[PDB]
Amino acid sequence: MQFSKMHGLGNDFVVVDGVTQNVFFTPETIRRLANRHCGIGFDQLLIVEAPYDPELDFHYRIFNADGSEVSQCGNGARCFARFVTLKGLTNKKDISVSTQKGNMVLTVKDDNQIRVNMGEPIWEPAKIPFTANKFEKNYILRTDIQTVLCGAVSMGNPHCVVQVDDIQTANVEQLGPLLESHERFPERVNAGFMQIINKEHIKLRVYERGAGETQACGSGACAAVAVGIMQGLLNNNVQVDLPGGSLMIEWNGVGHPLYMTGEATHIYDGFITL
């Protein structure tokens, strides 16, 4: 099995062409390959697959190092685009891909960065889903230790975004779990904590639905900027600093799709038996 090693936003990926090779991995195998001392070593495993849909170019799946398929964050999208380009699986500048949760369009920019069209943010509470009388720009959520204010939005998955004064001292450790499984989010939620530096720059940490905090949750960056724009606190183009790296988010408001732009880097190519 051929593979490539890449990195983006502070995570390292193993990327596999599952279009010209037939691959399937059980969690046990994934954990073995993810092991840094006896395996290849990675944070995320990305498989590029046939779309089984004439209106799409590819499908991709991502697995964590614990061997589970995951789909909260849209991570690996930049690596996916660079990989299919470098390997000649496509030569399209605008690439349409399905994921476990919603389609994306990936644009390979002239400066080599990758722009991902994440679709239009979804604001209606019932469609997030989130239990609320009606849409509000700021919702009041009571937890065991504090009542917080948040924006709520869906990008394919549910997000709630809390503004914090100082990103390093924000109580992600206690508030993250309390929000992620809050009763008002029937399908749970990705809980983002955003420090606004200025109208074009934020810092963000995300307690991911079913996973907790990692180095980067791209869709969390999208959600935080959408919320801030909706609230009047951010402009339409914003740099987001996640723990592991930065993204540029662009959103021209209702009626328009939201875009996320960032880098992906090829490291080496490998071959493994099994």
PDB file of C-alpha atoms in Angstrom:
ATOM      1  CA  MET A   1       0.000   0.000   0.000  1.00  0.00           C
ATOM      2  CA  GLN A   2       1.364   3.350  -1.079  1.00  0.00           C
ATOM      3  CA  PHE A   3       0.708   6.403   1.060  1.00  0.00           C
ATOM      4  CA  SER A   4       1.825   9.949   1.548  1.00  0.00           C
ATOM      5  CA  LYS A   5       2.631  11.836   4.735  1.00  0.00           C
ATOM      6  CA  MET A   6       1.368  15.401   4.964  1.00  0.00           C
ATOM      7  CA  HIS A   7       0.666  18.086   7.505  1.00  0.00           C
ATOM      8  CA  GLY A   8      -1.813  20.889   7.994  1.00  0.00           C
ATOM      9  CA  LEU A   9      -2.938  22.999  10.963  1.00  0.00           C
ATOM     10  CA  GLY A  10      -0.674  21.267  13.403  1.00  0.00           C
ATOM     11  CA  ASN A  11      -1.877  17.730  12.593  1.00  0.00           C
ATOM     12  CA  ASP A  12       0.080  15.121  10.640  1.00  0.00           C
ATOM     13  CA  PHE A  13      -1.774  12.946   8.193  1.00  0.00           C
ATOM     14  CA  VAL A  14      -1.357   9.737   6.370  1.00  0.00           C
ATOM     15  CA  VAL A  15      -3.144  10.089   3.045  1.00  0.00           C
ATOM     16  CA  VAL A  16      -4.056   7.094   0.971  1.00  0.00           C
ATOM     17  CA  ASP A  17      -5.317   6.752  -2.574  1.00  0.00           C
ATOM     18  CA  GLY A  18      -8.344   4.482  -2.073  1.00  0.00           C
ATOM     19  CA  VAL A  19      -9.411   5.033  -5.675  1.00  0.00           C
ATOM     20  CA  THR A  20      -6.628   3.067  -7.381  1.00  0.00           C
ATOM     21  CA  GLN A  21      -5.948   0.815  -4.373  1.00  0.00           C
ATOM     22  CA  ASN A  22      -8.587  -1.108  -2.420  1.00  0.00           C
ATOM     23  CA  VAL A  23      -8.126  -0.210   1.236  1.00  0.00           C
ATOM     24  CA  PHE A  24     -10.169  -0.770   4.338  1.00  0.00           C
ATOM     25  CA  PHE A  25      -8.942  -0.519   7.871  1.00  0.00           C
ATOM     26  CA  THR A  26     -10.370  -1.776  11.120  1.00  0.00           C
ATOM     27  CA  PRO A  27      -9.811   0.342  14.193  1.00  0.00           C
ATOM     28  CA  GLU A  28      -7.220  -2.109  15.420  1.00  0.00           C
ATOM     29  CA  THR A  29      -5.164  -1.683  12.273  1.00  0.00           C
ATOM     30  CA  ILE A  30      -5.532   2.062  12.357  1.00  0.00           C
ATOM     31  CA  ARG A  31      -4.234   2.278  15.885  1.00  0.00           C
ATOM     32  CA  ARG A  32      -1.282   0.112  14.908  1.00  0.00           C
ATOM     33  CA  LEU A  33      -0.405   2.348  11.957  1.00  0.00           C
ATOM     34  CA  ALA A  34      -0.932   5.491  14.055  1.00  0.00           C
ATOM     35  CA  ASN A  35       1.518   4.287  16.743  1.00  0.00           C
ATOM     36  CA  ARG A  36       4.559   6.536  16.568  1.00  0.00           C
ATOM     37  CA  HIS A  37       7.050   4.070  17.796  1.00  0.00           C
ATOM     38  CA  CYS A  38       6.015   0.924  15.997  1.00  0.00           C
ATOM     39  CA  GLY A  39       3.892   2.243  13.138  1.00  0.00           C
ATOM     40  CA  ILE A  40       3.897   5.067  10.629  1.00  0.00           C
ATOM     41  CA  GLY A  41       2.770   7.631  13.184  1.00  0.00           C
ATOM     42  CA  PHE A  42      -0.094  10.125  12.526  1.00  0.00           C
ATOM     43  CA  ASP A  43      -2.880  12.158  14.135  1.00  0.00           C
ATOM     44  CA  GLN A  44      -5.346  11.541  11.302  1.00  0.00           C
ATOM     45  CA  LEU A  45      -5.677   9.010   8.512  1.00  0.00           C
ATOM     46  CA  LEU A  46      -7.279  10.228   5.275  1.00  0.00           C
ATOM     47  CA  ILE A  47      -8.621   7.922   2.586  1.00  0.00           C
ATOM     48  CA  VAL A  48      -9.436   9.318  -0.852  1.00  0.00           C
ATOM     49  CA  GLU A  49     -12.260   7.259  -2.357  1.00  0.00           C
ATOM     50  CA  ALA A  50     -14.437   7.049  -5.391  1.00  0.00           C
ATOM     51  CA  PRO A  51     -17.565   9.189  -5.070  1.00  0.00           C
ATOM     52  CA  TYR A  52     -20.159   6.644  -6.385  1.00  0.00           C
ATOM     53  CA  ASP A  53     -21.959   9.752  -7.715  1.00  0.00           C
ATOM     54  CA  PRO A  54     -21.548  11.249 -11.196  1.00  0.00           C
ATOM     55  CA  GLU A  55     -21.946  14.775  -9.813  1.00  0.00           C
ATOM     56  CA  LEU A  56     -18.852  14.497  -7.546  1.00  0.00           C
ATOM     57  CA  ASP A  57     -15.164  13.933  -8.077  1.00  0.00           C
ATOM     58  CA  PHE A  58     -14.241  12.190  -4.836  1.00  0.00           C
ATOM     59  CA  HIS A  59     -15.318  11.093  -1.357  1.00  0.00           C
ATOM     60  CA  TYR A  60     -12.984  11.233   1.589  1.00  0.00           C
ATOM     61  CA  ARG A  61     -13.039   9.759   5.047  1.00  0.00           C
ATOM     62  CA  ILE A  62     -10.915  10.648   8.044  1.00  0.00           C
ATOM     63  CA  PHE A  63     -10.029   8.437  11.027  1.00  0.00           C
ATOM     64  CA  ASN A  64      -8.494   9.432  14.361  1.00  0.00           C
ATOM     65  CA  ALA A  65      -5.521   7.699  15.882  1.00  0.00           C
ATOM     66  CA  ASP A  66      -7.964   5.680  18.101  1.00  0.00           C
ATOM     67  CA  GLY A  67      -9.252   4.076  14.933  1.00  0.00           C
ATOM     68  CA  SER A  68     -12.697   5.697  14.677  1.00  0.00           C
ATOM     69  CA  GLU A  69     -14.130   7.418  11.642  1.00  0.00           C
ATOM     70  CA  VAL A  70     -14.719  11.113  12.492  1.00  0.00           C
ATOM     71  CA  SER A  71     -16.404  14.018  10.721  1.00  0.00           C
ATOM     72  CA  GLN A  72     -16.828  17.055  12.933  1.00  0.00           C
ATOM     73  CA  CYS A  73     -14.072  19.272  11.705  1.00  0.00           C
ATOM     74  CA  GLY A  74     -13.496  19.037   7.966  1.00  0.00           C
ATOM     75  CA  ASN A  75      -9.813  18.426   8.761  1.00  0.00           C
ATOM     76  CA  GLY A  76      -7.680  17.111   5.973  1.00  0.00           C
ATOM     77  CA  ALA A  77      -9.525  18.984   3.285  1.00  0.00           C
ATOM     78  CA  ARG A  78      -6.449  21.014   2.296  1.00  0.00           C
ATOM     79  CA  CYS A  79      -4.237  17.889   2.288  1.00  0.00           C
ATOM     80  CA  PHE A  80      -6.856  16.012   0.235  1.00  0.00           C
ATOM     81  CA  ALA A  81      -6.759  18.678  -2.498  1.00  0.00           C
ATOM     82  CA  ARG A  82      -2.956  18.892  -2.610  1.00  0.00           C
ATOM     83  CA  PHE A  83      -2.704  15.082  -2.663  1.00  0.00           C
ATOM     84  CA  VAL A  84      -5.168  14.463  -5.523  1.00  0.00           C
ATOM     85  CA  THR A  85      -3.384  17.219  -7.440  1.00  0.00           C
ATOM     86  CA  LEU A  86       0.166  16.003  -6.830  1.00  0.00           C
ATOM     87  CA  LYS A  87      -0.759  12.393  -7.580  1.00  0.00           C
ATOM     88  CA  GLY A  88      -2.678  13.219 -10.753  1.00  0.00           C
ATOM     89  CA  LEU A  89      -6.033  11.840  -9.619  1.00  0.00           C
ATOM     90  CA  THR A  90      -7.552  15.026 -10.958  1.00  0.00           C
ATOM     91  CA  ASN A  91      -6.294  18.138 -12.641  1.00  0.00           C
ATOM     92  CA  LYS A  92      -9.373  20.239 -11.893  1.00  0.00           C
ATOM     93  CA  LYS A  93      -8.874  23.568 -10.151  1.00  0.00           C
ATOM     94  CA  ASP A  94     -12.315  23.252  -8.432  1.00  0.00           C
ATOM     95  CA  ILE A  95     -12.807  19.799  -6.934  1.00  0.00           C
ATOM     96  CA  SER A  96     -16.141  18.557  -5.616  1.00  0.00           C
ATOM     97  CA  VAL A  97     -15.982  16.072  -2.737  1.00  0.00           C
ATOM     98  CA  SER A  98     -18.457  14.340  -0.489  1.00  0.00           C
ATOM     99  CA  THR A  99     -17.792  13.598   3.146  1.00  0.00           C
ATOM    100  CA  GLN A 100     -19.664  11.737   5.791  1.00  0.00           C
ATOM    101  CA  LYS A 101     -21.603  14.976   6.538  1.00  0.00           C
ATOM    102  CA  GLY A 102     -21.972  17.318   3.556  1.00  0.00           C
ATOM    103  CA  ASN A 103     -20.236  18.190   0.273  1.00  0.00           C
ATOM    104  CA  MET A 104     -17.284  20.557  -0.135  1.00  0.00           C
ATOM    105  CA  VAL A 105     -15.729  22.307  -3.114  1.00  0.00           C
ATOM    106  CA  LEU A 106     -11.971  22.621  -2.933  1.00  0.00           C
ATOM    107  CA  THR A 107     -10.138  25.276  -4.869  1.00  0.00           C
ATOM    108  CA  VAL A 108      -6.460  25.032  -5.495  1.00  0.00           C
ATOM    109  CA  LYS A 109      -5.283  28.633  -5.422  1.00  0.00           C
ATOM    110  CA  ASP A 110      -2.509  30.105  -7.577  1.00  0.00           C
ATOM    111  CA  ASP A 111      -0.372  30.521  -4.431  1.00  0.00           C
ATOM    112  CA  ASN A 112      -1.002  26.798  -3.755  1.00  0.00           C
ATOM    113  CA  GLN A 113      -3.244  27.415  -0.748  1.00  0.00           C
ATOM    114  CA  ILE A 114      -6.493  25.583  -0.671  1.00  0.00           C
ATOM    115  CA  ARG A 115      -9.864  27.321  -0.390  1.00  0.00           C
ATOM    116  CA  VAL A 116     -12.730  25.168   0.853  1.00  0.00           C
ATOM    117  CA  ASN A 117     -16.353  26.100   0.203  1.00  0.00           C
ATOM    118  CA  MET A 118     -18.178  24.951   3.306  1.00  0.00           C
ATOM    119  CA  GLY A 119     -21.674  25.907   2.174  1.00  0.00           C
ATOM    120  CA  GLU A 120     -24.034  28.396   3.769  1.00  0.00           C
ATOM    121  CA  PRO A 121     -24.228  28.530   7.581  1.00  0.00           C
ATOM    122  CA  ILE A 122     -27.508  27.258   9.003  1.00  0.00           C
ATOM    123  CA  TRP A 123     -29.087  29.437  11.692  1.00  0.00           C
ATOM    124  CA  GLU A 124     -32.585  28.077  12.394  1.00  0.00           C
ATOM    125  CA  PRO A 125     -32.402  26.362  15.804  1.00  0.00           C
ATOM    126  CA  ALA A 126     -34.452  23.341  14.839  1.00  0.00           C
ATOM    127  CA  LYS A 127     -32.109  22.619  11.905  1.00  0.00           C
ATOM    128  CA  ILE A 128     -28.879  22.851  13.952  1.00  0.00           C
ATOM    129  CA  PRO A 129     -30.340  21.146  15.971  1.00  0.00           C
ATOM    130  CA  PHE A 130     -30.647  23.256  19.099  1.00  0.00           C
ATOM    131  CA  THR A 131     -33.684  23.711  21.394  1.00  0.00           C
ATOM    132  CA  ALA A 132     -34.776  27.370  21.382  1.00  0.00           C
ATOM    133  CA  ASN A 133     -38.012  29.391  21.157  1.00  0.00           C
ATOM    134  CA  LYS A 134     -36.600  31.237  18.189  1.00  0.00           C
ATOM    135  CA  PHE A 135     -33.410  32.461  16.559  1.00  0.00           C
ATOM    136  CA  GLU A 136     -31.288  34.800  18.701  1.00  0.00           C
ATOM    137  CA  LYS A 137     -27.842  36.217  18.102  1.00  0.00           C
ATOM    138  CA  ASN A 138     -26.903  35.324  21.672  1.00  0.00           C
ATOM    139  CA  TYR A 139     -28.483  32.451  23.551  1.00  0.00           C
ATOM    140  CA  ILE A 140     -28.435  31.925  27.300  1.00  0.00           C
ATOM    141  CA  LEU A 141     -27.195  28.513  28.340  1.00  0.00           C
ATOM    142  CA  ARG A 142     -27.191  27.455  31.901  1.00  0.00           C
ATOM    143  CA  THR A 143     -24.548  25.060  33.183  1.00  0.00           C
ATOM    144  CA  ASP A 144     -23.781  23.670  36.562  1.00  0.00           C
ATOM    145  CA  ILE A 145     -21.051  26.233  37.190  1.00  0.00           C
ATOM    146  CA  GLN A 146     -21.838  29.260  35.029  1.00  0.00           C
ATOM    147  CA  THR A 147     -24.462  30.681  32.721  1.00  0.00           C
ATOM    148  CA  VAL A 148     -22.858  31.450  29.358  1.00  0.00           C
ATOM    149  CA  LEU A 149     -23.849  33.356  26.258  1.00  0.00           C
ATOM    150  CA  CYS A 150     -23.285  31.713  22.890  1.00  0.00           C
ATOM    151  CA  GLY A 151     -24.066  31.945  19.204  1.00  0.00           C
ATOM    152  CA  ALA A 152     -25.293  28.656  17.663  1.00  0.00           C
ATOM    153  CA  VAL A 153     -24.884  27.602  14.076  1.00  0.00           C
ATOM    154  CA  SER A 154     -24.553  24.532  11.836  1.00  0.00           C
ATOM    155  CA  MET A 155     -21.960  23.995   9.105  1.00  0.00           C
ATOM    156  CA  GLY A 156     -22.866  20.292   8.578  1.00  0.00           C
ATOM    157  CA  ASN A 157     -22.453  19.707  12.311  1.00  0.00           C
ATOM    158  CA  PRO A 158     -23.754  21.748  15.290  1.00  0.00           C
ATOM    159  CA  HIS A 159     -21.591  24.423  16.812  1.00  0.00           C
ATOM    160  CA  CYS A 160     -21.902  26.762  19.755  1.00  0.00           C
ATOM    161  CA  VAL A 161     -19.529  29.671  20.145  1.00  0.00           C
ATOM    162  CA  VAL A 162     -18.720  31.399  23.465  1.00  0.00           C
ATOM    163  CA  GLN A 163     -16.643  34.575  23.508  1.00  0.00           C
ATOM    164  CA  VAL A 164     -13.829  34.646  26.072  1.00  0.00           C
ATOM    165  CA  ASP A 165     -11.495  37.399  27.305  1.00  0.00           C
ATOM    166  CA  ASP A 166      -8.225  35.349  27.219  1.00  0.00           C
ATOM    167  CA  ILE A 167      -7.966  32.201  25.209  1.00  0.00           C
ATOM    168  CA  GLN A 168      -5.293  30.583  27.406  1.00  0.00           C
ATOM    169  CA  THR A 169      -7.287  30.949  30.621  1.00  0.00           C
ATOM    170  CA  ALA A 170     -10.744  30.239  29.285  1.00  0.00           C
ATOM    171  CA  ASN A 171     -12.299  27.309  31.206  1.00  0.00           C
ATOM    172  CA  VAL A 172     -12.372  24.945  28.255  1.00  0.00           C
ATOM    173  CA  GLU A 173     -11.576  22.042  30.578  1.00  0.00           C
ATOM    174  CA  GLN A 174     -14.840  22.327  32.549  1.00  0.00           C
ATOM    175  CA  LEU A 175     -17.148  24.303  30.249  1.00  0.00           C
ATOM    176  CA  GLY A 176     -16.296  22.252  27.162  1.00  0.00           C
ATOM    177  CA  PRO A 177     -17.791  19.011  28.522  1.00  0.00           C
ATOM    178  CA  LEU A 178     -20.777  20.837  29.983  1.00  0.00           C
ATOM    179  CA  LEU A 179     -21.596  22.480  26.659  1.00  0.00           C
ATOM    180  CA  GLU A 180     -20.743  19.500  24.404  1.00  0.00           C
ATOM    181  CA  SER A 181     -23.471  17.457  26.058  1.00  0.00           C
ATOM    182  CA  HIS A 182     -25.794  20.265  27.032  1.00  0.00           C
ATOM    183  CA  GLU A 183     -29.459  19.262  27.185  1.00  0.00           C
ATOM    184  CA  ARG A 184     -30.420  21.962  24.712  1.00  0.00           C
ATOM    185  CA  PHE A 185     -28.276  20.337  22.002  1.00  0.00           C
ATOM    186  CA  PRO A 186     -30.102  17.064  21.367  1.00  0.00           C
ATOM    187  CA  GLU A 187     -27.351  15.623  19.144  1.00  0.00           C
ATOM    188  CA  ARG A 188     -24.526  17.226  21.172  1.00  0.00           C
ATOM    189  CA  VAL A 189     -22.384  20.064  19.900  1.00  0.00           C
ATOM    190  CA  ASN A 190     -18.874  21.298  19.090  1.00  0.00           C
ATOM    191  CA  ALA A 191     -18.163  23.970  21.759  1.00  0.00           C
ATOM    192  CA  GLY A 192     -15.942  26.779  20.575  1.00  0.00           C
ATOM    193  CA  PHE A 193     -14.248  29.396  22.744  1.00  0.00           C
ATOM    194  CA  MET A 194     -13.276  32.551  20.848  1.00  0.00           C
ATOM    195  CA  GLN A 195     -11.077  35.463  21.827  1.00  0.00           C
ATOM    196  CA  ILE A 196     -11.616  38.427  19.496  1.00  0.00           C
ATOM    197  CA  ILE A 197      -8.377  40.338  18.954  1.00  0.00           C
ATOM    198  CA  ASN A 198      -9.846  42.717  16.404  1.00  0.00           C
ATOM    199  CA  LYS A 199     -12.520  42.634  13.671  1.00  0.00           C
ATOM    200  CA  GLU A 200     -10.235  40.592  11.370  1.00  0.00           C
ATOM    201  CA  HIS A 201      -8.439  38.367  13.895  1.00  0.00           C
ATOM    202  CA  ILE A 202      -9.522  35.823  16.517  1.00  0.00           C
ATOM    203  CA  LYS A 203      -7.959  33.040  18.607  1.00  0.00           C
ATOM    204  CA  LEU A 204     -10.020  29.872  19.011  1.00  0.00           C
ATOM    205  CA  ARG A 205     -10.119  26.622  20.976  1.00  0.00           C
ATOM    206  CA  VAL A 206     -12.785  23.937  20.292  1.00  0.00           C
ATOM    207  CA  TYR A 207     -14.069  21.080  22.438  1.00  0.00           C
ATOM    208  CA  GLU A 208     -15.143  18.749  19.664  1.00  0.00           C
ATOM    209  CA  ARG A 209     -18.321  16.769  19.758  1.00  0.00           C
ATOM    210  CA  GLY A 210     -17.373  13.258  20.869  1.00  0.00           C
ATOM    211  CA  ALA A 211     -13.634  14.049  21.097  1.00  0.00           C
ATOM    212  CA  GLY A 212     -12.675  17.048  23.235  1.00  0.00           C
ATOM    213  CA  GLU A 213      -9.903  19.484  22.424  1.00  0.00           C
ATOM    214  CA  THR A 214      -7.401  18.926  19.595  1.00  0.00           C
ATOM    215  CA  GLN A 215      -4.900  21.122  17.771  1.00  0.00           C
ATOM    216  CA  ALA A 216      -7.387  22.187  15.169  1.00  0.00           C
ATOM    217  CA  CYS A 217     -11.010  22.063  14.236  1.00  0.00           C
ATOM    218  CA  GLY A 218     -11.482  23.853  10.957  1.00  0.00           C
ATOM    219  CA  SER A 219     -15.248  23.810  10.947  1.00  0.00           C
ATOM    220  CA  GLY A 220     -15.095  25.305  14.448  1.00  0.00           C
ATOM    221  CA  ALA A 221     -13.106  28.177  12.944  1.00  0.00           C
ATOM    222  CA  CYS A 222     -15.821  28.584  10.287  1.00  0.00           C
ATOM    223  CA  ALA A 223     -18.598  28.590  12.915  1.00  0.00           C
ATOM    224  CA  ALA A 224     -16.862  31.097  15.174  1.00  0.00           C
ATOM    225  CA  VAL A 225     -16.340  33.587  12.335  1.00  0.00           C
ATOM    226  CA  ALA A 226     -19.928  33.104  11.099  1.00  0.00           C
ATOM    227  CA  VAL A 227     -21.187  33.818  14.587  1.00  0.00           C
ATOM    228  CA  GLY A 228     -18.991  36.875  15.020  1.00  0.00           C
ATOM    229  CA  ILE A 229     -20.032  38.294  11.670  1.00  0.00           C
ATOM    230  CA  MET A 230     -23.719  37.642  12.496  1.00  0.00           C
ATOM    231  CA  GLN A 231     -23.196  39.470  15.804  1.00  0.00           C
ATOM    232  CA  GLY A 232     -21.554  42.504  14.223  1.00  0.00           C
ATOM    233  CA  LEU A 233     -18.221  41.934  15.947  1.00  0.00           C
ATOM    234  CA  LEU A 234     -16.218  40.701  12.995  1.00  0.00           C
ATOM    235  CA  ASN A 235     -15.624  41.805   9.439  1.00  0.00           C
ATOM    236  CA  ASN A 236     -16.084  39.519   6.435  1.00  0.00           C
ATOM    237  CA  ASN A 237     -12.553  38.242   6.166  1.00  0.00           C
ATOM    238  CA  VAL A 238     -10.955  36.993   9.385  1.00  0.00           C
ATOM    239  CA  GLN A 239      -7.741  35.227  10.425  1.00  0.00           C
ATOM    240  CA  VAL A 240      -8.387  32.463  12.922  1.00  0.00           C
ATOM    241  CA  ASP A 241      -5.551  31.212  15.108  1.00  0.00           C
ATOM    242  CA  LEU A 242      -6.198  27.705  16.347  1.00  0.00           C
ATOM    243  CA  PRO A 243      -3.659  26.005  18.681  1.00  0.00           C
ATOM    244  CA  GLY A 244      -2.027  24.282  15.735  1.00  0.00           C
ATOM    245  CA  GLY A 245      -2.164  26.876  12.983  1.00  0.00           C
ATOM    246  CA  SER A 246      -4.171  29.580  11.214  1.00  0.00           C
ATOM    247  CA  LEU A 247      -6.971  29.776   8.679  1.00  0.00           C
ATOM    248  CA  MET A 248      -8.513  32.613   6.755  1.00  0.00           C
ATOM    249  CA  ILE A 249     -12.332  32.569   6.835  1.00  0.00           C
ATOM    250  CA  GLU A 250     -14.407  34.544   4.317  1.00  0.00           C
ATOM    251  CA  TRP A 251     -18.167  34.923   4.511  1.00  0.00           C
ATOM    252  CA  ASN A 252     -20.252  37.675   2.851  1.00  0.00           C
ATOM    253  CA  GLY A 253     -23.323  36.894   4.966  1.00  0.00           C
ATOM    254  CA  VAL A 254     -26.727  35.368   4.438  1.00  0.00           C
ATOM    255  CA  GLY A 255     -27.319  33.932   1.040  1.00  0.00           C
ATOM    256  CA  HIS A 256     -23.635  33.177   0.520  1.00  0.00           C
ATOM    257  CA  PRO A 257     -21.370  30.251   1.204  1.00  0.00           C
ATOM    258  CA  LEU A 258     -18.597  30.455   3.767  1.00  0.00           C
ATOM    259  CA  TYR A 259     -14.991  29.746   2.717  1.00  0.00           C
ATOM    260  CA  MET A 260     -11.993  28.488   4.668  1.00  0.00           C
ATOM    261  CA  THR A 261      -8.451  28.893   3.315  1.00  0.00           C
ATOM    262  CA  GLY A 262      -5.226  27.393   4.595  1.00  0.00           C
ATOM    263  CA  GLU A 263      -2.054  25.530   3.730  1.00  0.00           C
ATOM    264  CA  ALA A 264      -1.239  21.822   3.314  1.00  0.00           C
ATOM    265  CA  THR A 265       2.281  20.405   3.076  1.00  0.00           C
ATOM    266  CA  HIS A 266       3.625  17.198   1.515  1.00  0.00           C
ATOM    267  CA  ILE A 267       6.339  15.585   3.622  1.00  0.00           C
ATOM    268  CA  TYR A 268       7.254  12.159   2.137  1.00  0.00           C
ATOM    269  CA  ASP A 269       5.877   9.168   0.231  1.00  0.00           C
ATOM    270  CA  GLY A 270       5.827   5.682   1.689  1.00  0.00           C
ATOM    271  CA  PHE A 271       5.101   2.037   1.008  1.00  0.00           C
ATOM    272  CA  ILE A 272       3.999  -0.471   3.626  1.00  0.00           C
ATOM    273  CA  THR A 273       3.141  -4.144   3.506  1.00  0.00           C
ATOM    274  CA  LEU A 274      -0.234  -4.759   5.281  1.00  0.00           C
TER     275      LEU A 274
END
